[PDB]
Amino acid sequence: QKTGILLVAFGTSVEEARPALDKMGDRVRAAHPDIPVRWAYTAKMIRAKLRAEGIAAPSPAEALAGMAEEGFTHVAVQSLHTIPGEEFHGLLETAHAFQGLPKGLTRVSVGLPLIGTTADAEAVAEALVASLPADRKPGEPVVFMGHGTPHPADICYPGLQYYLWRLDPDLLVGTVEGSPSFDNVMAELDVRKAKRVWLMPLMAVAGDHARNDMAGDEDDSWTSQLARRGIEAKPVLHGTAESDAVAAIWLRHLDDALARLN
Amino acid sequence: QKTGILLVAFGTSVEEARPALDKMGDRVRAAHPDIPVRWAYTAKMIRAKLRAEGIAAPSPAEALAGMAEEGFTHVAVQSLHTIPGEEFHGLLETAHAFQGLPKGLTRVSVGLPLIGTTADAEAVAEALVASLPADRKPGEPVVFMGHGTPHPADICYPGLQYYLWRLDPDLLVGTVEGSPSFDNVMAELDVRKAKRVWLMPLMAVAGDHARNDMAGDEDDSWTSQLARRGIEAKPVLHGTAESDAVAAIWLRHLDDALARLN
Amino acid sequence: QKTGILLVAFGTSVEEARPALDKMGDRVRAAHPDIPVRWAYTAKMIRAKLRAEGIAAPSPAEALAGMAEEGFTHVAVQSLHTIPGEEFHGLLETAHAFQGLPKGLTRVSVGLPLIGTTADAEAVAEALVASLPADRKPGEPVVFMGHGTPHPADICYPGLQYYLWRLDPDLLVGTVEGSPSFDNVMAELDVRKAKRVWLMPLMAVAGDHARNDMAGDEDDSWTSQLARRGIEAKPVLHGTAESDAVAAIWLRHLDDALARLN
Amino acid sequence: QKTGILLVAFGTSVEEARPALDKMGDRVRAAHPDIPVRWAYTAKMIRAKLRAEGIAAPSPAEALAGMAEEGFTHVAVQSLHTIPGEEFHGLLETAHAFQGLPKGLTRVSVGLPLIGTTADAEAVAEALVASLPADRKPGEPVVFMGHGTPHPADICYPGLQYYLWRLDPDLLVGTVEGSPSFDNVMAELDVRKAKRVWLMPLMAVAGDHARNDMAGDEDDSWTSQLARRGIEAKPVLHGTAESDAVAAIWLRHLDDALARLN
Ligand code: HEM
Ligand code: HEM
Ligand SMILES: [Cl-]
Ligand SMILES: [Cl-]
Ligand SMILES: [Cl-]
Ligand SMILES: [Cl-]
Ligand code: NA
Ligand code: NA
Ligand code: NA
Ligand code: NA
Fold first, then answer.
1. Where is it localised (chains A, B, C, D)?
2. Which domain holds residue B178?
């Protein structure tokens, strides 16, 4: 009998972003000092870039196959995704495919992503507020940038908008590929006549979306579009994994997944 | 090769509520006149009550086992649930368990519940508005009553609240067992100082929640709580399956499930 | 928590053959007096004939769906098949598909068919010898008639021939659709110059194969072919479920399946 | 769309035995020159020994996870096992677990082991006879040594004995762990009063069973036991993968698995 933890993030190949994952690994090690911790990454393109730089970057299937070969029997897989979308559901199916294979893993549990229950959504809204930069003034809007998805779990972003507005009417959620859109966010900002607007990534790590879509020099970036509208944009290039308050939520979800192994 | 459709609702055992399901069956027959239509029900307690009244009320597993015995090969299962919650996920697992069984069904697809994508959520908000009673005046709040759930898909109800408010700030979502709660709804109503409030079930059929929790004579009902606060409550005891605009959404989801059989 | 037993035979629709299944049901009830016993049938054509006569004849899927609806949680499914062939493997897949379905069965185990391990094969050979008619004389060959199959488990019939010959060189195995063939059996009989030959069904119930292929009046029957060769054929129209010694083997396999539920 | 072949043997870590696998790899490459060929090994202890010598030795799960990462979509897994026993069934379950995983393999087929149908068993018996050493004289018994297993597929060894005896009454099958036992084989040899007896491995590669259990210097080896009985034992230390006639059977099974990918 041998318990392991498999941490699974979307993944990033940009070195300014990656230390935020190491931080998460330290938090997990601190909370479960006697349980081995392994990593896998869900984006196929990011694993390709990391392998290109000479770095091991297993898929969840490669990771679990390797853990089965090490003699692990019970593994808690923790998603560092934001929503239970396509990536999370793929992960769940992969994890459960390994469970019970002859001579392999006995039990493979999967921790919920950040926005799990409506109780999580409420805790996430509170944690995001606690994570705001000290320089943001009352009344200055903050736009949280999510990936967005065609998957049904896209509904987590407007759900989160509901909980954020219970706390502060000037906190907004926008996404690159889903709803609410950035056009919807600009319409929110126009009615508020906001002159300074903060932009913060909703995702665990500030990867390419945070750096280019949110804050790039190109015309199409959120910060470029806002500057054209006469708004002072203040991008914050740290993902939510940096915040202790946000990270506590993924940790609780891992505690729940570990309890499900018994 | 033989295609069938299996319609699956939560189910109701109250006779004033049931004709709304028959209506849905007529709509499906009208749209797919050459495809046989069968019914199953997801609530174990409702199947028990219906069997007690001498009425056949198969579970999804009983229904699919019987369809396999009739020689169906390809079956589109359409959920008449509101959200992709515990009932919907149980249905998906059951459906897929039958698919590919030796000598049984070849392919079993499953249509999304009402609030599927964020695009569905937006269409549902529009359809609910189109479904409002003609006597409701501008500015009179309307509270839509959902079941609510501990499942992660509970987040669909605050998500829907986001889309409803894009249309009319006085449309509210409350749930019996989840979030937003009825206490949250009363806090919304208090700030609006509303004197007349309409109550409409969000679920396909106005069963026991609509009739007792929403509109019962008991002190704990929504209409009783509102009357104690001096509000004229106007309960509407028809489920969303009665509305053509809402029903079109389940129909489109069935069309999508039928296309997935090829 | 509620344990049940599901007995699954190929099935027969001939009334002279069926009482042999009832016998098996009595044996099971006698051995497990406190555990409810249900029946299902694996041949689709036999279920069709039985339903035509007004008799309930559920498939394994219909039976397990109905047991889940009765509130059973742990079910031992016992195969009354002879070999782990196509029917047995279909049964195993169906059984395991039900296990773990949301709100349904917790655990569904499956008892091995008659010729399970090589230890079973040896016990079957001994039981068949104990079951021979008292009138068969030493040296008179006995041909055991199996169904035969294109499935890999067809190899059980020549395997059984090996164990039978360890007991008596004049015991032979033939099959209708597999190997050894009836032509192979006649070649065995020709070298023995046997003048009287007994024919016994290997299958649980003497259905249509026993009655027509083995012993029919038509030219193609085994008894007709033997009579053309000048051999006195002595067909025995009772299946192996009639023998206490053979039936004990299925009972032990059911005991093993019941132990697997804990 | 990208087809691959995964060859899976029990595996051997002895260097005198391994070239027989390379031979099989050449045969496969010759028959399917445009399809990439990968290897995996089913015995956990052999993968451990090979990794200890600095040699990559993936499990079937590690291999398929790696192939999915290379962008293969359709993979024919060919078992180089002798019987559809525990190893083969584990392989089938693992293979099918990978099939259909989100973003991974589309289709994973599995080729039958050597003794697949009774038609294979008959072809194997013919191929084994064709593979006998030219120095073996008519009437000298040959004992084929199988692993043996507690799994139900152990019945393949007495099944094969049936087909071998149709060809030559002095060809015998024995196993290390199943039936027929080596004691059963010595009883066969005693009745034949054989003075010289050949011993040949039934398995693909002459690993540790062939070299130690069959032909070791220790008292318990088959050759040592025979020498104590006054029999000249002639061990042949080549597995069946060396024979072209035996290898053709695995090749046909691979052709069948490749056809199942369409
Ligand atoms: C907002 C929350 C959720 C939504 C909207 C949702 C929606 C869906 C949808 C649309 C599918 C169909 C497959 C797909 O398109 O991905 C699905 C499948 C599935 N979901 Fe969820 N899901 C949610 C949360 C969860 C969570 C947290 C779990 C983990 C317990 C879960 C367990 C599953 C499983 C096991 C399936 C496979 C169904 C099958 O057996 O065929 N879902 N879900
Ligand atoms: C002589 C004995 C047996 C033979 C020759 C045999 C052979 C096979 C074959 C050829 C298959 C592929 C599917 C098919 O064509 O049916 C298979 C699948 C399977 N067998 Fe057996 N089998 C035997 C006994 C058993 C028994 C007694 C069990 C019950 C534990 C079993 C468990 C399974 C399972 C679970 C599969 C599905 C594989 C998958 O996951 O894809 N087998 N077997
Ligand atoms: Cl700060
Ligand atoms: Cl009206
Ligand atoms: Cl008698
Ligand atoms: Cl030679
Ligand atoms: Na996100
Ligand atoms: Na609802
Ligand atoms: Na039979
Ligand atoms: Na072997």
1. Periplasm
2. 115-238
